[PDB]
């Protein structure tokens, strides 16, 4: 069958926090894109420069699947040309992105009464990420003129914030699982093909 392992990305038991977003490299396989675009589960499925149907007749050097959790009102930030805490400080797509962004509501799994504080995002950073950059550092953010010597305190912020997802949140504040598929064509044989 040589079937590309999209099942292990999309049906993974848990997804990463967005500041520590996961990347899976997909290679040397036949990619059944029909199970994706025919899925009735996704609330977001937006492609840039390809179409899921006319991926079944294309080959790429590699395919990257990046996955993470954010809240619903941030899903729009997973798009080229966006601003916001997620696009600026957590996960950044390039202006000329080729790929697909897929997302679905995971309130049933990832929220808890009283709050699930296990999902985090970077709220403070000195500059914006470059496209496809990952920052997992936890240095104290100096927000004022007094230096902080890395402690946490007034004007000296821990850079990551918990989402605290609750199932009664409005949908804008419920958790969404996101997968981003990037399609890489290099001067190298192309090993990921549709059927």
């Amino acid at each position: 069958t040589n079937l590309c392992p999209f099942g292990e990305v999309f049906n993974a038991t848990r997804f990463a926090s967005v500041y520590a977003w996961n990347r899976k490299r997909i290679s040397n396989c036949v990619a059944d894109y029909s199970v994706l675009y025919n899925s009735a589960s996704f609330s977001t499925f937006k492609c840039y420069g390809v179409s899921p149907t006319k991926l079944n007749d294309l080959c790429f050097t590699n395919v990257y699947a990046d996955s993470f959790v954010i809240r619903g009102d941030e899903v729009r930030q997973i798009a080229p040309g966006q601003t916001g805490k997620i696009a600026d400080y957590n996960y950044k797509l390039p202006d000329d992105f080729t790929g697909c962004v897929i997302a679905w509501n995971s309130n049933n799994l990832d929220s808890k009464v009283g709050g699930n504080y296990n999902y985090l995002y970077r709220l403070f950073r000195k500059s914006n990420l470059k496209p496809f950059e990952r920052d997992i550092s936890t240095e104290i953010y100096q927000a004022g003129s007094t230096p902080c010597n890395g402690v946490e305190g007034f004007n000296c912020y821990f850079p990551l914030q918990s989402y605290g997802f609750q199932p009664t949140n409005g949908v804008g504040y419920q958790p969404y699982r996101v997968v981003v598929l990037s399609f890489e064509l290099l001067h190298a044989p192309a090993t990921v093909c549709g059927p």
Partner: antibody
Amino acid sequence: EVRLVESGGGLVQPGGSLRLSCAASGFTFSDYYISWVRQAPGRGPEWVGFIRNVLYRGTTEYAPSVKGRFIISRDDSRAIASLQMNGLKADDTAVYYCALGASGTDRDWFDVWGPGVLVTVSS
Amino acid sequence: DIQMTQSPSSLSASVGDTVTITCRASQDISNSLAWYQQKPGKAPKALIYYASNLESGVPSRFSGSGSGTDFTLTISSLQPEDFATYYCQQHNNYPFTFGPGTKVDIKR
């Protein structure tokens, strides 16, 4: 899948010492509180301690009956948590579990457990 | 340091029955009470938290009630697969403490 793979079960001598290790995969390990819970033959679970996540880096809490003798630690770069047991009385014989806090708070219950390893304390 | 007790020690019931088990805390824990199910050879499985909230994927035949010191787990439509020991756990504060368990046996 979410996996917590435990090591360290088997025979250990009273007055010896023993480290149990919990190797995680499938999620952002550093963002979770890790608990150790044990269960002696025929009895209910007993929480041993935990170590909080990156927002309170490295901070720990213990059951009174193991404080001082057991040390919980974690290495987020390797995605492991450990229980260093330096007392080791025969009473410590039990199945030991590592487990994730469901909410990531100090008001917590455990929704993901490792399989448990039996530690037998005996000369 | 909060002591948890449970009742009954054990019980037998037939498939399809409704079973009720109780848990008490030695001091007020508001509704910070969880329930676990433990099958042979296995780690406990979290069923209910904050006294009445189901964990994901847990069938609705499990329900919990109570607030303060006294709590109740109800299993309706008892199934053969529900053979297990059930434990309560207060989750209001740090030394998280567990009751002694109730064994549920299946009559057939």
